[PDB]
mmCIF file of N, CA, C and O in Angstrom:
data_model
loop_
_atom_site.group_PDB
_atom_site.id
_atom_site.type_symbol
_atom_site.label_atom_id
_atom_site.label_comp_id
_atom_site.label_asym_id
_atom_site.label_seq_id
_atom_site.Cartn_x
_atom_site.Cartn_y
_atom_site.Cartn_z
ATOM 1 N N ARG A 1 16.647 3.378 4.161
ATOM 2 C CA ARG A 1 16.992 3.169 5.596
ATOM 3 C C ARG A 1 17.454 4.445 6.298
ATOM 4 O O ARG A 1 18.594 4.884 6.135
ATOM 5 N N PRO A 2 16.561 5.059 7.097
ATOM 6 C CA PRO A 2 16.836 6.291 7.846
ATOM 7 C C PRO A 2 18.025 6.146 8.804
ATOM 8 O O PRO A 2 18.136 5.146 9.522
ATOM 9 N N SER A 3 18.892 7.158 8.813
ATOM 10 C CA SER A 3 20.084 7.173 9.660
ATOM 11 C C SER A 3 19.785 7.070 11.156
ATOM 12 O O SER A 3 20.663 6.722 11.948
ATOM 13 N N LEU A 4 18.535 7.337 11.534
ATOM 14 C CA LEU A 4 18.129 7.251 12.934
ATOM 15 C C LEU A 4 18.217 5.809 13.424
ATOM 16 O O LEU A 4 18.333 5.560 14.625
ATOM 17 N N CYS A 5 18.172 4.864 12.487
ATOM 18 C CA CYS A 5 18.237 3.445 12.811
ATOM 19 C C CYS A 5 19.633 2.982 13.257
ATOM 20 O O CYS A 5 19.783 1.873 13.767
ATOM 21 N N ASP A 6 20.643 3.834 13.068
ATOM 22 C CA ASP A 6 22.025 3.512 13.447
ATOM 23 C C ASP A 6 22.369 4.045 14.834
ATOM 24 O O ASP A 6 23.417 3.715 15.392
ATOM 25 N N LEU A 7 21.484 4.882 15.370
ATOM 26 C CA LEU A 7 21.658 5.489 16.687
ATOM 27 C C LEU A 7 21.588 4.463 17.818
ATOM 28 O O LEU A 7 20.907 3.444 17.710
ATOM 29 N N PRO A 8 22.333 4.698 18.906
ATOM 30 C CA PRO A 8 22.296 3.743 20.016
ATOM 31 C C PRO A 8 21.117 3.989 20.956
ATOM 32 O O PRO A 8 20.604 5.107 21.041
ATOM 33 N N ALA A 9 20.701 2.944 21.666
ATOM 34 C CA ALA A 9 19.608 3.071 22.618
ATOM 35 C C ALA A 9 19.995 4.131 23.650
ATOM 36 O O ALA A 9 21.125 4.138 24.161
ATOM 37 N N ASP A 10 19.056 5.027 23.939
ATOM 38 C CA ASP A 10 19.282 6.109 24.887
ATOM 39 C C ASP A 10 18.086 6.240 25.836
ATOM 40 O O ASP A 10 17.008 6.664 25.425
ATOM 41 N N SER A 11 18.298 5.906 27.108
ATOM 42 C CA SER A 11 17.252 5.976 28.129
ATOM 43 C C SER A 11 16.713 7.379 28.395
ATOM 44 O O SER A 11 15.598 7.539 28.898
ATOM 45 N N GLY A 12 17.517 8.387 28.082
ATOM 46 C CA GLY A 12 17.091 9.759 28.276
ATOM 47 C C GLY A 12 17.359 10.374 29.639
ATOM 48 O O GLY A 12 17.947 9.759 30.538
ATOM 49 N N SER A 13 16.861 11.595 29.787
ATOM 50 C CA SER A 13 17.023 12.396 30.994
ATOM 51 C C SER A 13 15.876 12.321 32.007
ATOM 52 O O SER A 13 16.098 12.527 33.195
ATOM 53 N N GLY A 14 14.671 12.008 31.535
ATOM 54 C CA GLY A 14 13.493 11.928 32.389
ATOM 55 C C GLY A 14 13.513 11.057 33.632
ATOM 56 O O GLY A 14 14.546 10.505 34.015
ATOM 57 N N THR A 15 12.343 10.910 34.252
ATOM 58 C CA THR A 15 12.216 10.129 35.483
ATOM 59 C C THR A 15 11.136 9.037 35.481
ATOM 60 O O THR A 15 10.837 8.457 36.529
ATOM 61 N N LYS A 16 10.533 8.769 34.324
ATOM 62 C CA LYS A 16 9.505 7.724 34.240
ATOM 63 C C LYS A 16 10.123 6.361 33.960
ATOM 64 O O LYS A 16 11.249 6.271 33.482
ATOM 65 N N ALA A 17 9.391 5.303 34.293
ATOM 66 C CA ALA A 17 9.855 3.939 34.054
ATOM 67 C C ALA A 17 9.008 3.347 32.928
ATOM 68 O O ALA A 17 7.969 2.728 33.160
ATOM 69 N N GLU A 18 9.440 3.587 31.696
ATOM 70 C CA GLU A 18 8.721 3.104 30.523
ATOM 71 C C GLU A 18 9.584 2.198 29.653
ATOM 72 O O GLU A 18 10.778 2.015 29.917
ATOM 73 N N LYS A 19 8.966 1.624 28.625
ATOM 74 C CA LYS A 19 9.652 0.726 27.700
ATOM 75 C C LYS A 19 9.408 1.204 26.283
ATOM 76 O O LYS A 19 8.304 1.631 25.951
ATOM 77 N N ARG A 20 10.448 1.164 25.459
ATOM 78 C CA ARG A 20 10.338 1.573 24.068
ATOM 79 C C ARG A 20 11.066 0.574 23.168
ATOM 80 O O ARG A 20 11.728 -0.355 23.641
ATOM 81 N N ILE A 21 10.956 0.797 21.865
ATOM 82 C CA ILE A 21 11.588 -0.061 20.883
ATOM 83 C C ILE A 21 12.606 0.753 20.089
ATOM 84 O O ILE A 21 12.346 1.895 19.705
ATOM 85 N N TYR A 22 13.779 0.169 19.883
ATOM 86 C CA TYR A 22 14.842 0.822 19.125
ATOM 87 C C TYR A 22 15.443 -0.226 18.198
ATOM 88 O O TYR A 22 15.488 -1.416 18.540
ATOM 89 N N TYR A 23 15.876 0.200 17.022
ATOM 90 C CA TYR A 23 16.485 -0.735 16.088
ATOM 91 C C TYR A 23 17.968 -0.933 16.381
ATOM 92 O O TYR A 23 18.752 0.007 16.304
ATOM 93 N N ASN A 24 18.329 -2.159 16.738
ATOM 94 C CA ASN A 24 19.717 -2.521 17.005
ATOM 95 C C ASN A 24 20.282 -2.965 15.653
ATOM 96 O O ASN A 24 20.018 -4.087 15.210
ATOM 97 N N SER A 25 21.030 -2.091 14.982
ATOM 98 C CA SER A 25 21.582 -2.444 13.669
ATOM 99 C C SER A 25 22.561 -3.616 13.705
ATOM 100 O O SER A 25 22.697 -4.343 12.719
ATOM 101 N N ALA A 26 23.198 -3.813 14.860
ATOM 102 C CA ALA A 26 24.157 -4.896 15.052
ATOM 103 C C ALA A 26 23.445 -6.246 15.037
ATOM 104 O O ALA A 26 23.828 -7.152 14.286
ATOM 105 N N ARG A 27 22.392 -6.375 15.842
ATOM 106 C CA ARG A 27 21.640 -7.626 15.899
ATOM 107 C C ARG A 27 20.606 -7.727 14.787
ATOM 108 O O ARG A 27 19.957 -8.760 14.639
ATOM 109 N N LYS A 28 20.452 -6.658 14.012
ATOM 110 C CA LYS A 28 19.482 -6.614 12.911
ATOM 111 C C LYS A 28 18.055 -6.891 13.388
ATOM 112 O O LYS A 28 17.300 -7.616 12.733
ATOM 113 N N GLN A 29 17.695 -6.331 14.541
ATOM 114 C CA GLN A 29 16.355 -6.522 15.090
ATOM 115 C C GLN A 29 15.868 -5.390 16.014
ATOM 116 O O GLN A 29 16.658 -4.656 16.604
ATOM 117 N N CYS A 30 14.553 -5.210 16.053
ATOM 118 C CA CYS A 30 13.922 -4.183 16.875
ATOM 119 C C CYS A 30 13.748 -4.722 18.274
ATOM 120 O O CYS A 30 12.963 -5.636 18.505
ATOM 121 N N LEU A 31 14.483 -4.152 19.216
ATOM 122 C CA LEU A 31 14.416 -4.625 20.581
ATOM 123 C C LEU A 31 13.863 -3.611 21.566
ATOM 124 O O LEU A 31 13.736 -2.421 21.269
ATOM 125 N N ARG A 32 13.552 -4.118 22.749
ATOM 126 C CA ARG A 32 12.997 -3.341 23.843
ATOM 127 C C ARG A 32 14.117 -2.710 24.674
ATOM 128 O O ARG A 32 15.220 -3.255 24.760
ATOM 129 N N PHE A 33 13.843 -1.531 25.229
ATOM 130 C CA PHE A 33 14.801 -0.826 26.083
ATOM 131 C C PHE A 33 14.057 0.134 27.015
ATOM 132 O O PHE A 33 12.927 0.535 26.724
ATOM 133 N N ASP A 34 14.668 0.443 28.157
ATOM 134 C CA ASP A 34 14.076 1.342 29.147
ATOM 135 C C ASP A 34 14.190 2.821 28.759
ATOM 136 O O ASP A 34 15.275 3.311 28.436
ATOM 137 N N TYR A 35 13.067 3.530 28.791
ATOM 138 C CA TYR A 35 13.043 4.954 28.460
ATOM 139 C C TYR A 35 12.449 5.713 29.650
ATOM 140 O O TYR A 35 11.566 5.197 30.347
ATOM 141 N N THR A 36 12.933 6.935 29.867
ATOM 142 C CA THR A 36 12.500 7.761 30.996
ATOM 143 C C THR A 36 11.380 8.759 30.737
ATOM 144 O O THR A 36 10.933 9.427 31.667
ATOM 145 N N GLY A 37 10.944 8.876 29.482
ATOM 146 C CA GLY A 37 9.871 9.795 29.142
ATOM 147 C C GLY A 37 10.327 11.102 28.520
ATOM 148 O O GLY A 37 9.513 11.866 27.994
ATOM 149 N N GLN A 38 11.631 11.363 28.563
ATOM 150 C CA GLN A 38 12.192 12.593 28.008
ATOM 151 C C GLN A 38 13.611 12.352 27.495
ATOM 152 O O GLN A 38 14.308 11.459 27.978
ATOM 153 N N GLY A 39 14.031 13.162 26.524
ATOM 154 C CA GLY A 39 15.372 13.052 25.970
ATOM 155 C C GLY A 39 15.606 11.908 24.999
ATOM 156 O O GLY A 39 14.703 11.508 24.259
ATOM 157 N N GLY A 40 16.835 11.395 24.990
ATOM 158 C CA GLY A 40 17.182 10.300 24.106
ATOM 159 C C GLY A 40 17.376 10.727 22.666
ATOM 160 O O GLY A 40 17.638 11.899 22.391
ATOM 161 N N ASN A 41 17.252 9.775 21.743
ATOM 162 C CA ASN A 41 17.410 10.066 20.323
ATOM 163 C C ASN A 41 16.244 9.553 19.479
ATOM 164 O O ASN A 41 15.319 8.931 19.997
ATOM 165 N N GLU A 42 16.309 9.794 18.173
ATOM 166 C CA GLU A 42 15.253 9.370 17.256
ATOM 167 C C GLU A 42 15.012 7.866 17.104
ATOM 168 O O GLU A 42 13.965 7.462 16.602
ATOM 169 N N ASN A 43 15.976 7.036 17.496
ATOM 170 C CA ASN A 43 15.794 5.585 17.405
ATOM 171 C C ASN A 43 14.942 5.181 18.621
ATOM 172 O O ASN A 43 15.386 4.435 19.494
ATOM 173 N N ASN A 44 13.702 5.677 18.642
ATOM 174 C CA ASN A 44 12.769 5.459 19.746
ATOM 175 C C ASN A 44 11.340 5.327 19.208
ATOM 176 O O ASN A 44 10.782 6.279 18.678
ATOM 177 N N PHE A 45 10.752 4.144 19.357
ATOM 178 C CA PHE A 45 9.401 3.875 18.873
ATOM 179 C C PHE A 45 8.560 3.265 19.978
ATOM 180 O O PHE A 45 9.064 2.479 20.782
ATOM 181 N N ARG A 46 7.270 3.604 19.989
ATOM 182 C CA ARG A 46 6.336 3.066 20.973
ATOM 183 C C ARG A 46 5.837 1.699 20.530
ATOM 184 O O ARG A 46 5.499 0.855 21.359
ATOM 185 N N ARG A 47 5.817 1.475 19.220
ATOM 186 C CA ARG A 47 5.353 0.208 18.681
ATOM 187 C C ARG A 47 6.431 -0.474 17.845
ATOM 188 O O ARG A 47 7.111 0.163 17.046
ATOM 189 N N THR A 48 6.606 -1.771 18.076
ATOM 190 C CA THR A 48 7.602 -2.580 17.379
ATOM 191 C C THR A 48 7.439 -2.569 15.869
ATOM 192 O O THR A 48 8.426 -2.520 15.131
ATOM 193 N N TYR A 49 6.192 -2.630 15.415
ATOM 194 C CA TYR A 49 5.924 -2.656 13.993
ATOM 195 C C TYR A 49 6.437 -1.409 13.305
ATOM 196 O O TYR A 49 6.960 -1.485 12.188
ATOM 197 N N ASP A 50 6.301 -0.269 13.973
ATOM 198 C CA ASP A 50 6.773 0.990 13.422
ATOM 199 C C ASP A 50 8.298 0.989 13.294
ATOM 200 O O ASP A 50 8.858 1.534 12.342
ATOM 201 N N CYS A 51 8.959 0.339 14.247
ATOM 202 C CA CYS A 51 10.408 0.220 14.229
ATOM 203 C C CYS A 51 10.802 -0.678 13.055
ATOM 204 O O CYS A 51 11.759 -0.381 12.342
ATOM 205 N N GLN A 52 10.037 -1.752 12.837
ATOM 206 C CA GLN A 52 10.326 -2.683 11.747
ATOM 207 C C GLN A 52 10.132 -2.082 10.359
ATOM 208 O O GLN A 52 11.009 -2.203 9.508
ATOM 209 N N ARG A 53 9.002 -1.422 10.126
ATOM 210 C CA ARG A 53 8.746 -0.841 8.815
ATOM 211 C C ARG A 53 9.658 0.330 8.503
ATOM 212 O O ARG A 53 9.816 0.717 7.343
ATOM 213 N N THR A 54 10.268 0.876 9.548
ATOM 214 C CA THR A 54 11.185 1.989 9.405
ATOM 215 C C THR A 54 12.630 1.511 9.266
ATOM 216 O O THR A 54 13.366 2.003 8.416
ATOM 217 N N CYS A 55 13.014 0.524 10.073
ATOM 218 C CA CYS A 55 14.392 0.043 10.078
ATOM 219 C C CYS A 55 14.747 -1.351 9.546
ATOM 220 O O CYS A 55 15.877 -1.553 9.117
ATOM 221 N N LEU A 56 13.833 -2.318 9.638
ATOM 222 C CA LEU A 56 14.113 -3.669 9.143
ATOM 223 C C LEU A 56 13.968 -3.790 7.629
ATOM 224 O O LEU A 56 12.861 -3.517 7.106
#
């Protein structure tokens, strides 16, 4: 279990209106969150399955 999975959701510094997946270790599930296209942290995936095989 990569330590990136413990990181909190981070929308970032950018200006785009996008959606990404991050592993919420508290709820034990890969959830959706708003991303700006730049910045943030490693707990950021474009596909839910990738978040699951990495963190669940």
